[PDB]
Amino acid sequence: TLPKPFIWAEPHFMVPKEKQVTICCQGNYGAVEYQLHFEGSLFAVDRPKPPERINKVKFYIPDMNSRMAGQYSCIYRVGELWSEPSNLLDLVVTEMYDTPTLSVHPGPEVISGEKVTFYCRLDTATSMFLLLKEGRSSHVQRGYGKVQAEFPLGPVTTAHRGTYRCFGSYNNHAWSFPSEPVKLLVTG
């Protein structure tokens, strides 16, 4: 019938407080109404006009705050029928309260083969920490620990090069400021 919609965040799902993010929803060409839902509520509506050559709509967020951090989904309509919900997208708010420290073992310059571990520390937060690697091989890892979490990389390759920052969290959707960055240099 109607293909499952797909949503994603731009530039990504990690949104500094007071900053802006957009959520795209892909439905289907000719779809006449798109709704963005946030945790059981209607967040926003788009009505493509003309709809024939449109299969994606953009939902804007001007002013990120803690109350907009949570789970979103999108549905769309062609005729009278609504699609199934999209994948469920989590937005988080960052730049929240305190700043964590990030350290690296054995050090920020290594040769391929050396085992590298990052440690994130933050004093008055939950047990959940996040390690963010920036750039092209850019991704977020979640770890747990009391006041400090470890993030073992194992034996590194050149693939591990990059700039790391870490976050603490006050809840699963509300994160600290990012740590000062650590740039991991890997030879060989």
From Swiss-Prot:
One of its GO terms (cellular component) is plasma membrane. N-glycosylated. It comes from the Eukaryota. Selectively expressed by both resting and activated NK cells. Keywords: Cell membrane, Disulfide bond, Glycoprotein, Immunoglobulin domain, Membrane, Receptor, Repeat, Signal, Transmembrane, Transmembrane helix. The keyword Heme does not apply. It is a single-pass type I membrane protein. Its main location: membrane. It is found in: Cell membrane. Cytotoxicity-activating receptor that may contribute to the increased efficiency of activated natural killer (NK) cells to mediate tumor cell lysis. Interacts with CD247 and FCER1G. This is Natural cytotoxicity triggering receptor 1. The lineage of its organism: Eukaryota, Metazoa, Chordata, Craniata, Vertebrata. The gene is NCR1. The chain holds residues 25 to 212 of 304 of the full protein.
